[PDB]
């Protein structure tokens, strides 16, 4: 059923929340045992906000590999994500280190660092170009070299160094900083945009490893982005564009991050933001 006819008859009929719980009902359940071990209590922003056993992101040291992370392989659509909470005052070093072991390329953050009075995240790069970060525990340095501020996102060039080899990679830091305190937009173009530049950057493509998306839990804003680009990749590579289904693409995701679409709004507005999409994919 092509999913603009899906939209109206939702919308009209006001549905969206029974929608929203169908997919809550269906989505898998797996182990997330090495989250909730004691010593990993202050590597967690929320209790109820775990990676699952098989599909976390391990840190390349025997000490303690644990961070709050998961891979999402999409194998149709041949694209890989990680999804990550923001990073907290003891996890900045490992958020670094998973950046570096991973080979990723770009990082995308959909959150700004205060909202609604409150931290949702460190700051965890550098804001100035001669006052650069170390980070001690992983062995790491982290340099500003430009930043480019525009109405409805901010890009930064990084300069990730590990003190250990002297290599050096360039990282590109993708903010979207207009998304509302409360609720969603109420347009998608900016959004979709925003997607357009970083796929645009490589930062999506398989020279590189996969992109690290993150919010404040990395499970709503960041399972939006991720689900829109799928969705509108497969519409590209399929005989019928139409056959794409988004509540089972966002089933599929489901199996490597508990949670994702937090909200039935949230639900809403993912669909929009593919179906405004689709009019530049179909060639329009």
Known sequence: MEMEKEFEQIDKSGSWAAIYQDIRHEASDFPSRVAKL?????RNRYRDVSPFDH?????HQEDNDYINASLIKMEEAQRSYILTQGPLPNTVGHFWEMVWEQKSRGVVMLNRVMEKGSLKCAQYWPQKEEKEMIFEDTNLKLTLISEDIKSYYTVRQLELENL????????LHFHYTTWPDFGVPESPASFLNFLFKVRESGSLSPEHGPVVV????????????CLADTCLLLMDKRKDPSSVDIKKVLLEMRKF????????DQLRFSYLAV????????GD
């Open 38 to 42: 004691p010593k990993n209590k202050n």
């Open 55 to 59: 599909s976390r992101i391990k840190l």
């Open 164 to 171: 250990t080899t002297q290599e050096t990679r360039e990282i």
């Open 214 to 225: 993150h919010c404040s839990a990395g499970i709503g804003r960041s399972g939006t982005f």
């Open 257 to 264: 991050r508990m949670g994702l679409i937090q909200t039935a």
């Open 275 to 282: 179906i405004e999409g689709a009019k530049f994919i179909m």
